[PDB]
Amino acid sequence: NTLQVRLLSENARMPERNHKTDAGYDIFSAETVVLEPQEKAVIKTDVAVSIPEGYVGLLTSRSGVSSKTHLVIETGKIDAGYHGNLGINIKNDAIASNGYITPGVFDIKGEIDLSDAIRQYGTYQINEGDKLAQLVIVPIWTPELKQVEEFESF
Amino acid sequence: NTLQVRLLSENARMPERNHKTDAGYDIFSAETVVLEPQEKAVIKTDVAVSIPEGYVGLLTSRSGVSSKTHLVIETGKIDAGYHGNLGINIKNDAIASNGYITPGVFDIKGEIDLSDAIRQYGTYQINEGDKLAQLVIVPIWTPELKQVEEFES
Amino acid sequence: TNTLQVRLLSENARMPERNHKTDAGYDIFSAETVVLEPQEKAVIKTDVAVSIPEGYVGLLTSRSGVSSKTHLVIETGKIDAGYHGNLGINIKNDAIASNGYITPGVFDIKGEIDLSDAIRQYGTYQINEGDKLAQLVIVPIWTPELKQVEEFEF
Ligand SMILES: O=c1ccn([C@H]2C[C@H](O)[C@@H](COP(=O)(O)NP(=O)(O)OP(=O)(O)O)O2)c(=O)[nH]1
Ligand SMILES: O=c1ccn([C@H]2C[C@H](O)[C@@H](COP(=O)(O)NP(=O)(O)OP(=O)(O)O)O2)c(=O)[nH]1
Ligand SMILES: O=c1ccn([C@H]2C[C@H](O)[C@@H](COP(=O)(O)NP(=O)(O)OP(=O)(O)O)O2)c(=O)[nH]1
Ligand SMILES: [Mg+2]
Numbered sequence: 178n179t180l181q182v183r184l185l186s187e188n189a190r191m192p193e194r195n196h197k198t199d200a201g202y203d204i205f206s207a208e209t210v211v212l213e214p215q216e217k218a219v220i221k222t223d224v225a226v227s228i229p230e231g232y233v234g235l236l237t238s239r240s241g242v243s244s245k246t247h248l249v250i251e252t253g254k255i256d257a258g259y260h261g262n263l264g265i266n267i268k269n270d271a272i273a274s275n276g277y278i279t280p281g282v283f284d285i286k287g288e289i290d291l292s293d294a295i296r297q298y299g300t301y302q303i304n305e306g307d308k309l310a311q312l313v314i315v316p317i318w319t320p321e322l323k324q325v326e327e328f329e330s331f
Numbered sequence: 332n333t334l335q336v337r338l339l340s341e342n343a344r345m346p347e348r349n350h351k352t353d354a355g356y357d358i359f360s361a362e363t364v365v366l367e368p369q370e371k372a373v374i375k376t377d378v379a380v381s382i383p384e385g386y387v388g389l390l391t392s393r394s395g396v397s398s399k400t401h402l403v404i405e406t407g408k409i410d411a412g413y414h415g416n417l418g419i420n421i422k423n424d425a426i427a428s429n430g431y432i433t434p435g436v437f438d439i440k441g442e443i444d445l446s447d448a449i450r451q452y453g454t455y456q457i458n459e460g461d462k463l464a465q466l467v468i469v470p471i472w473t474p475e476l477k478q479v480e481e482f483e484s
Numbered sequence: 485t486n487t488l489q490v491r492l493l494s495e496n497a498r499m500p501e502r503n504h505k506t507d508a509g510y511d512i513f514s515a516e517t518v519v520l521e522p523q524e525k526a527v528i529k530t531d532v533a534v535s536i537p538e539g540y541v542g543l544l545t546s547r548s549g550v551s552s553k554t555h556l557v558i559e560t561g562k563i564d565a566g567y568h569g570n571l572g573i574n575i576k577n578d579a580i581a582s583n584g585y586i587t588p589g590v591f592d593i594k595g596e597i598d599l600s601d602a603i604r605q606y607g608t609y610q611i612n613e614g615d616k617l618a619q620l621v622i623v624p625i626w627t628p629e630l631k632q633v634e635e636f637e638f
């Protein structure tokens with residue numbers, strides 16, 4: 178079938194499936210943001226999708242970013258009616274450096290880049306264009322609810 | 332079809348689909364509990380559901396709570412036929428204030444309320460009735476496993 | 485089919501197991517003994533490969549016991565159709581560092597204290613070969629061609 182995608186700015190990029198049978202469409206950052214230990218942000222994708230009713234999108238981590246960095250993405254449940262900007266819900270869960278500073282910053286590959294500041298160690302720079310998350314779409318069941326006193330069939 | 336729900340106490344609320352085409356059902360806390368930085372708890376819903384065979388429940392965060400507070404909910408996999416009280420598996424992942432106390436507490440909206448004690452900064456109070464989590468029901472594939480020496484299709 | 489092929493990569497490997505015929509997932513066992521101290525991160529090998537067919541994704545995910553009773557945080561892995569690699573449990577010990585308090589026991593994945601081979605920092609876990617650390621839940625996926633549109637039709 179087809180999934181409609183709107184790009185909402187010049188900074189947006191069509192999501193992308195790595196191989197032909199891969200679960201997820203890789204999702205790209207539309208923003209450049211510095212995120213220091215213990216900091217939280219919603220990173221904009223500048224992408225809207227129209228998931229049909231009877232499916233849910235799971236906006237979720239990539240295992241390389243996840244395993245190799247302190248960047249923790251809380252999986253977002255994207256409803257069928259939602260035509261807004263998909264935001265990536267992120268925390269840098271590194272423990273604070275208590276003021277050790279260094280001239281480099283980490284990127285989402287776990288490598289060190291040149292920065293515009295001498296920044297606290299454990300700080301990441303997410304750059305516009307970074308392949309930061311993925312979007313997996315799964316069918317759902319959304320029945321009517323019946324309150325009962327008894328069910329019937331850690 | 333229909334999903335059966337049992338309210339297990341007077342503090343239990345029915346799960347709630349917010350908007351017409353929402354994936355899941357919002358789940359309320361049946362307890363009032365303080366959760367200071369780095370603390371963990373299973374928050375009782377006092378609700379049981381009966382997910383049919385062929386499905387799993389995902390008992391998961393709401394994006395507002397998740398993004399605006401330090402309350403981290405670990406997604407629960409709710410098996411068909413689990414008829415127990417659904418527990419919300421939660422951590423306050425704020426780093427401890429090292430002794431700094433404030434007369435307010437945070438709630439799940441990110442906002443400050445009067446509290447019963449002067450409490451460590453970064454503490455949340457979860458109140459009975461708070462819309463804390465959500466439940467999304469997905470079909471599953473549950474095959475027999477075959478051990479193979481080599482993969483063959 | 486209603487068959488999933490599974491390939492054990494070593495003698496430290498254990499066949500995944502369903503807990504009841506009503507359970508969503510297959511319990512997945514550690515193939516390695518690893519110590520994980522507060523704030524540390526690792527990918528725990530299972531020495532299991534699976535062949536998830538096209539149209540599905542595996543979700544390599546926490547068990548509620550381990551998760552609620554310990555500081556071991558497992559980031560849910562999205563296991564693609566046709567990935568025949570070693571399944572890796574992406575794990576962090578998210579306890580805050582005990583700053584040099586050491587004790588003769590270590591924690592296990594059940595929240596209990598075991599004798600260990602070193603006097604280690606308090607909050608450290610020992611994950612043992614054969615521990616039932618995660619589960620795998622397999623769900624159908626929707627993988628449509630994306631259509632970029634100008635307008636659709638928290
Ligand atoms: O990580 C996320 C999560 C959600 N979203 C969007 C899509 C989703 O359909 C919408 C609402 O998700 P939640 O229901 O998880 N948030 P909450 O329940 O706090 O807000 P609302 O009152 O709108 O349902 O927010 C994101 O862009 N990224
Ligand atoms: O966040 C959760 C997760 C699970 N549960 C319930 C429903 C689920 O069917 C049940 C078991 O889930 P797991 O299989 O993840 N727990 P574990 O494997 O530790 O226990 P068991 O041996 O009972 O399967 O616990 C919750 O109430 N909240
Ligand atoms: O926790 C995990 C996650 C993934 N995996 C495997 C299975 C999956 O099919 C593969 C890649 O998953 P991602 O797409 O999340 N990783 P990434 O996007 O960083 O790498 P790739 O470039 O391989 O897509 O790694 C694990 O063994 N454990
Ligand atoms: Mg990938």
Ligand SMILES: [Mg+2]
Nearest residue numbers: 349393394465
């Ligand atoms: Mg909602």
Ligand SMILES: [Mg+2]
Nearest residue numbers: 503547548619
């Ligand atoms: Mg289990």
Ligand SMILES: [Mg+2]
Nearest residue numbers: 270424578579
């Ligand atoms: Mg933490």
